[PDB]
Design a binder for this molecule. Structure first.
Ligand SMILES: [Ca+2]
Ligand SMILES: [Ca+2]
Length: 351
């Protein structure tokens, strides 16, 4: 209806910059090779043994994140026994295909998400584990992740807050800033654009910055049930946008047996977020029916690697949002272009 009309004006205003400058007027080719906006997805173990999953990933996503392989339990399954070999293998795969990778995650506030050995230790020995995690993992992945989900779901857990108070949150963002300062420190949480916890969230981010925590970017996870209302999402994003920090839809999915409802769910979120000027990237939390943590009713591509309707919608969406043109005045999307020399055009200036 009318939200799509508004969303598209917003898209062409904020996602495009006019072209042909110098560092003419007749016969040129304007092809886009890289996209500044993030159309990412979560990667899992399949990328290590499944060539089709990998090939698909590389032809559908320009940003990655690890579904488990950089969570604390997976990096320290037993206290003192430390491993990063899977996560490193994936960091190499990503770097081979120049895919920027979100780092996920240093800490998780809900008890259900942390190593079981941590759950029986006294507080001081808990913090000792926290200290090596932050310092061992922060140093190992220094310069390897564009972002960190420093702590996740503080609004819905209390494992660390209950033993050290909100001052331990400040600790996590300060110490991570110290070890890897080029990394964008994220808050990440759920039920904020899917459910209506955006006012609570915005207050939470405020509270974090006001106690000195350097949080620099807001992650909204974007886990929906069976419907995605584009206007309720847009209003909710506006509430968070008041903080002047970038918004990222970090882990999108919805679940509906009807692939058509999904396809429409994916378009409501993706188009609205892309339209919203505070949003800077959208990552889907999985794609394949054979390896989606919400099961096959969350997939865009089928068990047998044939697209379903959400997959083709996603693909159609990305073609819509790509500047291929032969024509010397062009509204081109932010990214890298090939002109027939390779050439960038970033978000920096409004031209
Ligand atoms: Ca793993
Ligand atoms: Ca959410």
């Amino acid at each position: 209806q009318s939200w799509r009309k508004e969303a598209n004006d917003r898209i062409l205003q904020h996602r495009q910059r006019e072209l042909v400058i110098n560092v003419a007027g007749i016969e040129v080719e304007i092809k886009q090779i890289r996209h500044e906006f993030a159309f990412g997805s979560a990667m899992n173990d399949q990328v290590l043994f499944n060539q089709t999953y990998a090939d698909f990933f590389v032809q559908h996503f320009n940003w990655a994140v690890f579904e488990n392989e950089a969570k604390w339990y997976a990096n320290e399954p037993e206290r003192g026994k430390i491993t990063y070999e899977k996560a490193d293998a994936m960091l190499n795969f990503a770097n081979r295909h120049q895919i920027p990778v979100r780092g996920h995650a240093l800490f998780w506030e809900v008890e259900d998400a942390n190593p079981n050995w941590l759950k029986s230790l006294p507080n001081h020995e808990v913090y000792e584990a926290m200290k090596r995690r932050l310092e061992h993992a922060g140093n190992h992945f220094k310069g390897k992740f564009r972002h960190w989900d420093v702590n996740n779901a503080m609004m819905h857990g209390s494992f660390f807050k209950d033993r050290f108070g909100k001052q331990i949150w400040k600790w996590m963002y300060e110490e991570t800033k110290k070890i890897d300062p080029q990394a964008l420190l994220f808050v990440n949480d759920y039920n904020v654009i899917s459910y209506g916890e955006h006012h609570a969230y915005k207050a939470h981010i405020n509270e974090l910055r006001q106690l000195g925590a350097p949080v620099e970017a807001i992650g909204v996870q974007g886990h929906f049930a069976d419907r995605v209302d584009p206007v309720v999402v847009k209003e909710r994003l506006d509430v968070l946008a008041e903080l002047g920090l970038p918004i990222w839809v970090t882990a999108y999915d919805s679940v509906h047996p009807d692939a058509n409802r999904r396809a429409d769910n994916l378009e409501a979120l993706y188009r609205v977020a892309f339209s919203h000027p505070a949003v800077k990237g959208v990552l889907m939390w999985g794609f394949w029916a054979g390896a989606h943590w919400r099961g096959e009713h969350a997939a865009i591509v089928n068990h047998d690697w044939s697209l379903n309707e959400a997959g083709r919608r996603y693909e159609k969406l990305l073609q819509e949002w790509t500047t291929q043109r032969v024509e010397v005045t062009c509204p081109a999307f932010h990214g890298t272009y090939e002109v027939r020399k390779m050439l960038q055009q970033q978000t920096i200036e409004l031209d």
